From a paper:
The 10 mAbs that exhibited high affinity for the major repeat and varying degrees of cross-reactivity induced two distinct conformations in the antigen. Comparison of the 1210- and MGG4-like binding modes revealed that the N-core conformation was largely dictated by the HCDR3. All seven 1210-like mAbs contained a bulky Lys or Tyr residue six positions from the end of the HCDR3 (termed here position HCDR3(-6)) that directly occluded the MGG4-like conformation through steric hindrance. The presence of an HCDR3(-6) Lys/Tyr appeared to correlate with IGHJ gene usage because all seven 1210-like mAbs were encoded by IGHJ6∗02, where Tyr is the GL-encoded HCDR3(-6) residue40. For five of the seven 1210-like mAbs (Ky15.2, Ky15.3, Ky15.5, Ky15.7, and Ky15.8), this position was occupied by a Lys residue that formed a salt bridge with the Asp at the beginning of the N-core when DPNA was bound in this site. Ky15.10 and Ky315 had lower binding affinities to junctional peptides KQPA and NPDP compared with the five 1210-like mAbs with an HCDR3(-6) Lys residue. This suggests that the Lys residue facilitates high-affinity binding to junctional epitopes where DPNA is present in the N-core, which aligns with the register by which the 1210-like mAbs bind KQPA and NPDP. In addition to the change in binding conformation, we also noted a register shift in the peptide as Ky15.11-S100IK bound the KQPA peptide with DPNA in the N-core like all other 1210-like mAbs crystallized with the KQPA peptide (Ky15.2, Ky15.8, and Ky15.10), whereas the wild-type Ky15.11 mAb positioned this motif in the C-core like the other MGG4-like mAbs. We also noted that 1210-like mAbs bind peptides derived from the PfCSP junction (KQPA and NPDP) with a preferred register that positions the major NANP repeat in the center of the epitope between the N- and C-core motifs.
IGHV3-33-encoded antibodies are prevalent in the human humoral response against the Plasmodium falciparum circumsporozoite protein (PfCSP). As the most abundant surface protein expressed by Pf sporozoites and with essential roles in parasite development and invasion, Pf circumsporozoite protein (PfCSP) is a major target for biomedical interventions. PfCSP is composed of three domains: an N-terminal domain that undergoes proteolytic cleavage prior to hepatocyte invasion; a polymorphic, T cell epitope-containing C-terminal domain; and a conserved central region largely composed of consecutive major NANP repeat motifs. In total, 22 antibody fragment (Fab)-antigen complex structures were solved at 1.54- to 2.95-Å resolution to gain insights into whether differences in potency are associated with different features of PfCSP repeat recognition.
Numbering used by the authors:
A (entry chain P): 5 to 15
B (entry chain L): 1 to 94, 96 to 214
C (entry chain H): 1 to 52, 52A, 53 to 82, 82A, 82B, 82C, 83 to 100, 100A, ...
Amino acid sequence: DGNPDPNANPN
Amino acid sequence: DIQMTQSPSTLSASVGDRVTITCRASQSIASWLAWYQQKPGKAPKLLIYKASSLESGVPSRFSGSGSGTEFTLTISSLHPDDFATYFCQQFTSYWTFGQGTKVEIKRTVAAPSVFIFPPSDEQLKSGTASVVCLLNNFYPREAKVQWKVDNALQSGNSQESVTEQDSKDSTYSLSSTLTLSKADYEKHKVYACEVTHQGLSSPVTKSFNRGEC
Amino acid sequence: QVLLVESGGGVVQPGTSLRLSCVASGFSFSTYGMHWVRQSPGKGLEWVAIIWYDGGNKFYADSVQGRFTVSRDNSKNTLYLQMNSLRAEDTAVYYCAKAYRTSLDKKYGMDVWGQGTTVTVSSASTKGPSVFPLAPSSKSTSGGTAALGCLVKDYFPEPVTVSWNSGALTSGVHTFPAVLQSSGLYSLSSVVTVPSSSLGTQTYICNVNHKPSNTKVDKKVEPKSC
Protein backbone atom coordinates (compact mmCIF):
# COMPACT_ATOMS: atom_id res chain seq x y z
CA ASP A 1 0.00 0.00 0.00
CA GLY A 2 1.92 2.99 1.34
CA ASN A 3 5.29 1.36 0.72
CA PRO A 4 7.58 4.21 -0.43
CA ASP A 5 9.70 1.82 -2.51
CA PRO A 6 10.16 2.99 -6.12
CA ASN A 7 9.96 -0.64 -7.28
CA ALA A 8 6.61 -1.04 -5.52
CA ASN A 9 3.29 -1.42 -7.37
CA PRO A 10 2.99 1.65 -9.65
CA ASN A 11 -0.52 0.71 -10.78
CA ASP B 1 21.77 0.85 -7.78
CA ILE B 2 22.95 -2.72 -8.44
CA GLN B 3 25.46 -3.37 -11.22
CA MET B 4 24.65 -6.05 -13.79
CA THR B 5 27.43 -7.73 -15.79
CA GLN B 6 26.98 -10.09 -18.74
CA SER B 7 29.18 -12.73 -20.40
CA PRO B 8 30.01 -13.45 -23.12
CA SER B 9 29.73 -10.13 -24.95
CA THR B 10 29.53 -11.84 -28.35
CA LEU B 11 28.55 -15.46 -28.94
CA SER B 12 28.87 -17.24 -32.30
CA ALA B 13 26.81 -20.37 -32.97
CA SER B 14 25.04 -22.28 -35.73
CA VAL B 15 21.33 -23.01 -36.15
CA GLY B 16 20.28 -25.86 -33.86
CA ASP B 17 23.00 -25.25 -31.25
CA ARG B 18 22.60 -24.84 -27.50
CA VAL B 19 23.80 -21.52 -26.06
CA THR B 20 23.82 -20.12 -22.52
CA ILE B 21 24.23 -16.47 -21.50
CA THR B 22 25.23 -15.64 -17.92
CA CYS B 23 24.15 -12.49 -16.05
CA ARG B 24 25.85 -11.55 -12.77
CA ALA B 25 24.72 -9.10 -10.08
CA SER B 26 26.82 -7.07 -7.64
CA GLN B 27 24.47 -7.95 -4.77
CA SER B 28 21.61 -10.40 -4.37
CA ILE B 29 18.46 -9.55 -6.34
CA ALA B 30 16.54 -12.70 -5.30
CA SER B 31 14.68 -13.59 -8.50
CA TRP B 32 13.86 -10.01 -9.58
CA LEU B 33 15.52 -10.42 -12.97
CA ALA B 34 14.12 -10.05 -16.49
CA TRP B 35 15.50 -11.01 -19.91
CA TYR B 36 15.06 -8.91 -23.06
CA GLN B 37 15.70 -9.53 -26.76
CA GLN B 38 16.47 -6.64 -29.12
CA LYS B 39 16.83 -6.87 -32.90
CA PRO B 40 18.60 -3.92 -34.57
CA GLY B 41 16.28 -0.99 -35.21
CA LYS B 42 13.58 -2.38 -32.88
CA ALA B 43 12.62 -2.01 -29.23
CA PRO B 44 13.61 -4.60 -26.62
CA LYS B 45 11.05 -7.38 -26.15
CA LEU B 46 10.53 -9.09 -22.80
CA LEU B 47 11.10 -12.85 -23.00
CA ILE B 48 11.45 -14.00 -19.38
CA TYR B 49 10.20 -12.35 -16.18
CA LYS B 50 11.15 -13.15 -12.58
CA ALA B 51 14.15 -15.24 -13.70
CA SER B 52 12.29 -18.31 -15.04
CA SER B 53 8.74 -17.45 -16.21
CA LEU B 54 8.41 -17.33 -20.00
CA GLU B 55 6.07 -14.59 -21.16
CA SER B 56 3.13 -15.40 -23.43
CA GLY B 57 3.99 -16.47 -26.97
CA VAL B 58 7.72 -16.93 -26.39
CA PRO B 59 8.87 -20.34 -27.70
CA SER B 60 9.50 -23.00 -25.06
CA ARG B 61 13.09 -23.37 -26.28
CA PHE B 62 13.95 -20.30 -24.21
CA SER B 63 14.63 -20.97 -20.54
CA GLY B 64 15.89 -18.99 -17.57
CA SER B 65 17.48 -20.16 -14.34
CA GLY B 66 19.26 -18.75 -11.32
CA SER B 67 18.83 -16.78 -8.10
CA GLY B 68 20.71 -14.23 -6.03
CA THR B 69 23.81 -13.08 -7.89
CA GLU B 70 24.12 -15.27 -11.02
CA PHE B 71 21.49 -16.06 -13.65
CA THR B 72 21.44 -17.86 -16.99
CA LEU B 73 19.45 -17.80 -20.22
CA THR B 74 19.48 -20.95 -22.36
CA ILE B 75 18.27 -21.50 -25.93
CA SER B 76 18.07 -25.22 -26.64
CA SER B 77 17.80 -25.02 -30.46
CA LEU B 78 18.77 -21.69 -32.02
CA HIS B 79 16.37 -20.64 -34.76
CA PRO B 80 17.23 -17.95 -37.36
CA ASP B 81 14.85 -15.67 -35.42
CA ASP B 82 16.80 -16.02 -32.14
CA PHE B 83 20.03 -14.36 -33.34
CA ALA B 84 19.92 -10.95 -31.65
CA THR B 85 21.32 -8.95 -28.74
CA TYR B 86 20.17 -10.03 -25.27
CA PHE B 87 19.97 -7.83 -22.17
CA CYS B 88 19.25 -8.74 -18.55
CA GLN B 89 17.59 -6.36 -16.09
CA GLN B 90 17.17 -6.33 -12.32
CA PHE B 91 14.07 -4.58 -10.97
CA THR B 92 14.42 -4.70 -7.18
CA SER B 93 16.56 -1.56 -6.67
CA TYR B 94 15.41 0.80 -9.42
CA TRP B 95 16.13 -0.69 -12.87
CA THR B 96 19.58 -1.42 -14.30
CA PHE B 97 20.55 -3.42 -17.38
CA GLY B 98 23.51 -5.48 -18.56
CA GLN B 99 25.96 -4.50 -21.28
CA GLY B 100 24.39 -6.98 -23.70
CA THR B 101 25.20 -10.27 -25.44
CA LYS B 102 25.02 -10.42 -29.23
CA VAL B 103 24.35 -13.84 -30.76
CA GLU B 104 26.06 -14.14 -34.15
CA ILE B 105 25.57 -16.80 -36.82
CA LYS B 106 28.58 -19.08 -37.17
CA ARG B 107 29.21 -20.01 -40.81
CA THR B 108 31.98 -21.28 -43.05
CA VAL B 109 34.92 -18.88 -43.29
CA ALA B 110 34.73 -16.50 -46.26
CA ALA B 111 37.85 -14.53 -47.20
CA PRO B 112 37.32 -10.79 -47.80
CA SER B 113 37.48 -9.16 -51.22
CA VAL B 114 39.63 -6.04 -50.76
CA PHE B 115 39.33 -2.93 -52.94
CA ILE B 116 40.79 0.57 -52.66
CA PHE B 117 39.43 3.86 -54.01
CA PRO B 118 41.64 6.95 -54.47
CA PRO B 119 40.19 10.42 -53.79
CA SER B 120 38.07 12.24 -56.33
CA ASP B 121 39.40 15.37 -58.01
CA GLU B 122 36.25 17.21 -56.90
CA GLN B 123 37.04 16.49 -53.25
CA LEU B 124 40.66 17.55 -53.81
CA LYS B 125 39.39 20.86 -55.18
CA SER B 126 37.63 21.30 -51.81
CA GLY B 127 40.94 20.92 -49.96
CA THR B 128 40.48 17.42 -48.51
CA ALA B 129 41.33 13.88 -49.62
CA SER B 130 39.59 10.68 -48.50
CA VAL B 131 40.99 7.23 -49.32
CA VAL B 132 38.60 4.31 -48.83
CA CYS B 133 39.48 0.63 -48.41
CA LEU B 134 36.58 -1.82 -48.83
CA LEU B 135 36.29 -5.38 -47.49
CA ASN B 136 33.32 -7.19 -49.04
CA ASN B 137 31.45 -10.34 -47.93
CA PHE B 138 33.71 -11.91 -45.32
CA TYR B 139 33.31 -14.02 -42.19
CA PRO B 140 34.18 -13.77 -39.38
CA ARG B 141 33.76 -10.08 -38.55
CA GLU B 142 37.15 -9.93 -36.83
CA ALA B 143 39.57 -8.26 -39.24
CA LYS B 144 42.54 -5.89 -39.14
CA VAL B 145 42.60 -3.02 -41.66
CA GLN B 146 45.88 -1.12 -41.28
CA TRP B 147 46.64 2.00 -43.34
CA LYS B 148 50.25 2.45 -44.47
CA VAL B 149 51.25 5.80 -46.00
CA ASP B 150 54.76 5.69 -47.50
CA ASN B 151 55.38 2.39 -45.68
CA ALA B 152 54.48 4.12 -42.39
CA LEU B 153 51.61 2.80 -40.30
CA GLN B 154 48.91 5.44 -39.80
CA SER B 155 47.03 6.00 -36.55
CA GLY B 156 44.14 8.26 -35.57
CA ASN B 157 43.32 9.40 -39.12
CA SER B 158 40.80 6.77 -40.26
CA GLN B 159 37.23 5.77 -39.40
CA GLU B 160 35.69 2.35 -39.99
CA SER B 161 32.12 1.23 -40.59
CA VAL B 162 30.93 -2.39 -40.49
CA THR B 163 27.60 -3.58 -41.86
CA GLU B 164 25.17 -5.82 -40.04
CA GLN B 165 25.34 -9.54 -40.77
CA ASP B 166 23.88 -10.27 -44.20
CA SER B 167 20.51 -12.01 -44.39
CA LYS B 168 21.26 -14.36 -47.29
CA ASP B 169 24.84 -15.53 -46.65
CA SER B 170 25.65 -14.23 -43.12
CA THR B 171 28.67 -12.19 -44.27
CA TYR B 172 30.05 -8.79 -43.27
CA SER B 173 31.38 -5.77 -45.13
CA LEU B 174 33.69 -3.03 -43.90
CA SER B 175 34.84 0.40 -45.10
CA SER B 176 37.87 2.22 -43.67
CA THR B 177 38.13 5.88 -44.72
CA LEU B 178 41.46 7.73 -44.42
CA THR B 179 40.83 11.48 -44.65
CA LEU B 180 43.78 13.88 -45.05
CA SER B 181 44.03 17.51 -46.07
CA LYS B 182 45.05 18.11 -49.68
CA ALA B 183 48.31 19.68 -48.46
CA ASP B 184 49.38 16.55 -46.58
CA TYR B 185 48.05 14.19 -49.25
CA GLU B 186 50.40 15.76 -51.81
CA LYS B 187 53.35 15.31 -49.42
CA HIS B 188 53.43 11.51 -49.79
CA LYS B 189 53.39 9.08 -52.71
CA VAL B 190 52.31 5.51 -51.90
CA TYR B 191 49.03 4.85 -50.08
CA ALA B 192 48.04 1.31 -49.12
CA CYS B 193 45.76 -0.75 -46.89
CA GLU B 194 46.86 -4.16 -45.60
CA VAL B 195 44.23 -6.67 -44.46
CA THR B 196 44.85 -9.52 -42.02
CA HIS B 197 42.06 -12.10 -41.86
CA GLN B 198 41.57 -15.75 -40.95
CA GLY B 199 40.29 -16.66 -44.42
CA LEU B 200 43.38 -15.18 -46.07
CA SER B 201 46.48 -17.37 -46.08
CA SER B 202 48.70 -14.27 -46.20
CA PRO B 203 48.03 -10.57 -45.55
CA VAL B 204 46.66 -8.82 -48.65
CA THR B 205 47.75 -5.29 -49.62
CA LYS B 206 46.14 -2.95 -52.15
CA SER B 207 48.07 0.21 -53.00
CA PHE B 208 48.27 3.16 -55.38
CA ASN B 209 50.88 5.84 -55.95
CA ARG B 210 49.92 9.51 -55.94
CA GLY B 211 50.04 10.82 -59.50
CA GLU B 212 49.80 7.42 -61.19
CA CYS B 213 46.11 7.29 -60.23
CA GLN C 1 -2.84 -4.58 -29.01
CA VAL C 2 -0.87 -2.77 -26.29
CA LEU C 3 0.90 -0.18 -28.45
CA LEU C 4 3.06 2.73 -27.26
CA VAL C 5 4.37 5.32 -29.74
CA GLU C 6 6.90 8.04 -28.82
CA SER C 7 7.21 11.51 -30.37
CA GLY C 8 9.02 14.80 -29.78
CA GLY C 9 12.55 13.74 -30.70
CA GLY C 10 14.85 15.70 -32.95
CA VAL C 11 18.07 17.69 -33.11
CA VAL C 12 18.45 20.28 -30.34
CA GLN C 13 21.28 22.60 -29.36
CA PRO C 14 22.96 22.10 -25.96
CA GLY C 15 21.39 23.91 -23.03
CA THR C 16 17.86 23.98 -24.46
CA SER C 17 14.63 22.17 -23.59
CA LEU C 18 12.63 19.36 -25.18
CA ARG C 19 9.36 17.63 -24.28
CA LEU C 20 8.94 14.04 -25.44
CA SER C 21 5.53 12.41 -25.72
CA CYS C 22 4.35 8.79 -25.49
CA VAL C 23 0.84 7.82 -26.62
CA ALA C 24 -0.83 4.65 -25.31
CA SER C 25 -3.52 2.34 -26.71
CA GLY C 26 -4.77 -1.18 -26.09
CA PHE C 27 -4.80 -0.91 -22.29
CA SER C 28 -6.01 1.29 -19.45
CA PHE C 29 -3.33 3.99 -19.36
CA SER C 30 -4.84 5.52 -16.21
CA THR C 31 -4.45 2.27 -14.25
CA TYR C 32 -0.78 1.68 -15.13
CA GLY C 33 2.56 3.19 -14.24
CA MET C 34 4.98 4.20 -16.98
CA HIS C 35 8.75 4.30 -17.44
CA TRP C 36 11.26 6.18 -19.57
CA VAL C 37 14.41 4.32 -20.66
CA ARG C 38 17.16 5.52 -23.01
CA GLN C 39 19.84 3.69 -25.02
CA SER C 40 23.02 5.32 -26.29
CA PRO C 41 25.74 3.37 -28.14
CA GLY C 42 28.22 4.00 -25.32
CA LYS C 43 26.30 3.87 -22.03
CA GLY C 44 23.83 1.21 -23.20
CA LEU C 45 20.30 0.92 -21.87
CA GLU C 46 19.72 3.23 -18.90
CA TRP C 47 16.57 3.86 -16.88
CA VAL C 48 15.48 7.51 -16.72
CA ALA C 49 12.19 8.01 -14.89
CA ILE C 50 9.08 6.29 -13.55
CA ILE C 51 5.70 7.92 -12.90
CA TRP C 52 2.82 6.50 -10.90
CA TYR C 53 -0.62 5.81 -12.35
CA ASP C 54 -2.15 8.92 -10.76
CA GLY C 55 0.81 11.14 -11.63
CA GLY C 56 1.85 11.51 -7.99
CA ASN C 57 4.96 9.48 -7.22
CA LYS C 58 7.83 10.37 -9.58
CA PHE C 59 11.36 8.96 -9.37
CA TYR C 60 14.34 9.80 -11.56
CA ALA C 61 17.91 8.72 -12.17
CA ASP C 62 20.58 10.87 -10.56
CA SER C 63 21.99 11.66 -14.01
CA VAL C 64 18.76 13.40 -15.08
CA GLN C 65 17.79 14.65 -11.61
CA GLY C 66 17.11 18.39 -11.45
CA ARG C 67 16.78 18.72 -15.23
CA PHE C 68 14.30 16.13 -16.48
CA THR C 69 10.63 16.14 -15.48
CA VAL C 70 8.07 13.37 -16.05
CA SER C 71 4.32 13.94 -16.22
CA ARG C 72 1.19 12.44 -17.72
CA ASP C 73 -2.32 13.42 -18.84
CA ASN C 74 -4.56 10.39 -18.32
CA SER C 75 -7.34 12.15 -20.24
CA LYS C 76 -5.22 12.31 -23.41
CA ASN C 77 -3.51 8.95 -22.67
CA THR C 78 -0.12 10.64 -23.17
CA LEU C 79 3.09 10.43 -21.12
CA TYR C 80 5.56 13.31 -21.14
CA LEU C 81 9.27 13.86 -20.48
CA GLN C 82 10.41 17.49 -20.29
CA MET C 83 14.19 17.46 -20.79
CA ASN C 84 15.86 20.73 -19.79
CA SER C 85 19.49 21.87 -19.77
CA LEU C 86 20.36 19.38 -22.49
CA ARG C 87 23.95 18.15 -22.66
CA ALA C 88 25.74 16.03 -25.26
CA GLU C 89 25.56 12.87 -23.13
CA ASP C 90 21.74 12.99 -23.19
CA THR C 91 21.87 12.02 -26.88
CA ALA C 92 20.17 8.64 -27.27
CA VAL C 93 16.99 6.86 -28.30
CA TYR C 94 14.30 7.26 -25.62
CA TYR C 95 11.71 4.51 -25.11
CA CYS C 96 8.54 4.58 -23.02
CA ALA C 97 7.70 1.37 -21.21
CA LYS C 98 4.57 0.22 -19.38
CA ALA C 99 4.81 -1.41 -15.96
CA TYR C 100 3.94 -5.03 -15.23
CA ARG C 101 0.51 -6.27 -14.13
CA THR C 102 -0.58 -5.81 -10.52
CA SER C 103 0.12 -9.01 -8.58
CA LEU C 104 1.03 -10.25 -5.11
CA ASP C 105 4.64 -9.31 -5.90
CA LYS C 106 6.50 -6.49 -4.16
CA LYS C 107 8.94 -5.53 -6.96
CA TYR C 108 7.81 -4.62 -10.48
CA GLY C 109 9.49 -4.20 -13.88
CA MET C 110 8.46 -3.35 -17.45
CA ASP C 111 6.75 -5.54 -20.07
CA VAL C 112 5.89 -3.60 -23.26
CA TRP C 113 8.14 -0.94 -24.78
CA GLY C 114 7.56 1.48 -27.65
CA GLN C 115 9.43 2.03 -30.90
CA GLY C 116 11.42 5.02 -29.65
CA THR C 117 12.18 8.65 -30.51
CA THR C 118 15.74 9.82 -31.18
CA VAL C 119 17.14 12.90 -29.44
CA THR C 120 20.38 14.35 -30.82
CA VAL C 121 22.13 17.18 -28.97
CA SER C 122 24.70 18.98 -31.11
CA SER C 123 26.03 22.41 -32.01
CA ALA C 124 26.00 21.68 -35.74
CA SER C 125 23.54 23.16 -38.22
CA THR C 126 21.70 21.61 -41.15
CA LYS C 127 24.19 20.89 -43.95
CA GLY C 128 23.64 19.27 -47.33
CA PRO C 129 25.70 16.26 -48.41
CA SER C 130 28.68 16.60 -50.75
CA VAL C 131 28.69 13.43 -52.87
CA PHE C 132 32.05 12.27 -54.24
CA PRO C 133 32.62 9.29 -56.56
CA LEU C 134 34.48 6.11 -55.60
CA ALA C 135 35.81 5.49 -59.10
CA PRO C 136 36.53 1.90 -60.21
CA SER C 137 39.96 1.02 -61.56
CA SER C 138 42.41 -1.86 -61.86
CA LYS C 139 42.88 -1.41 -58.08
CA SER C 140 39.18 -2.08 -57.35
CA THR C 141 38.87 -5.23 -59.48
CA SER C 142 38.90 -8.84 -58.26
CA GLY C 143 38.35 -11.54 -60.87
CA GLY C 144 35.78 -10.23 -63.33
CA THR C 145 34.20 -8.21 -60.51
CA ALA C 146 34.59 -4.46 -59.98
CA ALA C 147 33.59 -2.13 -57.14
CA LEU C 148 32.29 1.43 -57.45
CA GLY C 149 30.43 3.73 -55.08
CA CYS C 150 29.73 7.22 -53.78
CA LEU C 151 31.01 9.02 -50.68
CA VAL C 152 28.34 11.07 -48.87
CA LYS C 153 30.52 13.27 -46.66
CA ASP C 154 29.83 16.08 -44.16
CA TYR C 155 26.06 16.14 -43.74
CA PHE C 156 23.80 16.92 -40.79
CA PRO C 157 21.50 15.70 -39.51
CA GLU C 158 20.62 12.10 -40.32
CA PRO C 159 19.10 10.47 -42.31
CA VAL C 160 20.33 10.20 -45.89
CA THR C 161 18.94 7.67 -48.36
CA VAL C 162 21.08 6.34 -51.22
CA SER C 163 19.63 4.66 -54.32
CA TRP C 164 21.27 3.41 -57.51
CA ASN C 165 20.09 4.12 -61.07
CA SER C 166 16.86 5.51 -59.59
CA GLY C 167 16.09 2.10 -58.10
CA ALA C 168 16.73 -0.07 -61.15
CA LEU C 169 19.94 -1.41 -59.55
CA THR C 170 18.96 -3.49 -56.51
CA SER C 171 21.73 -6.13 -56.44
CA GLY C 172 25.28 -5.81 -55.15
CA VAL C 173 24.68 -2.64 -53.11
CA HIS C 174 26.15 -2.29 -49.62
CA THR C 175 25.31 1.00 -47.90
CA PHE C 176 27.28 1.46 -44.73
CA PRO C 177 26.07 2.69 -41.35
CA ALA C 178 26.95 6.38 -41.09
CA VAL C 179 29.86 7.46 -38.88
CA LEU C 180 29.92 10.69 -36.88
CA GLN C 181 33.11 12.67 -37.49
CA SER C 182 35.05 15.04 -35.24
CA SER C 183 33.43 17.96 -37.09
CA GLY C 184 29.98 17.06 -35.75
CA LEU C 185 28.83 16.01 -39.23
CA TYR C 186 27.99 12.57 -40.58
CA SER C 187 29.41 10.67 -43.54
CA LEU C 188 28.87 7.29 -45.19
CA SER C 189 29.57 5.28 -48.33
CA SER C 190 27.42 3.15 -50.63
CA VAL C 191 29.36 0.62 -52.72
CA VAL C 192 28.20 -1.69 -55.51
CA THR C 193 30.02 -4.71 -56.97
CA VAL C 194 29.34 -5.08 -60.72
CA PRO C 195 30.90 -7.05 -63.65
CA SER C 196 34.12 -5.53 -64.95
CA SER C 197 32.86 -5.80 -68.54
CA SER C 198 29.89 -3.50 -67.80
CA LEU C 199 32.01 -0.38 -67.13
CA GLY C 200 32.21 0.53 -70.82
CA THR C 201 28.52 0.28 -71.73
CA GLN C 202 26.63 0.63 -68.42
CA THR C 203 26.17 3.93 -66.57
CA TYR C 204 26.05 3.80 -62.75
CA ILE C 205 24.50 6.76 -60.90
CA CYS C 206 24.10 7.15 -57.14
CA ASN C 207 20.90 8.96 -56.11
CA VAL C 208 21.36 10.54 -52.68
CA ASN C 209 18.36 12.06 -50.88
CA HIS C 210 18.76 14.13 -47.70
CA LYS C 211 15.28 15.38 -46.76
CA PRO C 212 16.40 17.47 -43.73
CA SER C 213 17.84 19.93 -46.29
CA ASN C 214 15.50 19.12 -49.22
CA THR C 215 18.58 18.19 -51.26
CA LYS C 216 18.80 15.52 -53.96
CA VAL C 217 22.17 14.98 -55.66
CA ASP C 218 22.61 12.46 -58.48
CA LYS C 219 26.22 11.60 -59.31
CA LYS C 220 27.64 9.53 -62.17
CA VAL C 221 30.56 7.31 -61.17
CA GLU C 222 33.00 7.05 -64.04
CA PRO C 223 35.99 4.70 -64.27
CA LYS C 224 39.44 6.23 -63.82
CA SER C 225 42.54 5.43 -65.87
CA CYS C 226 44.68 3.26 -63.61
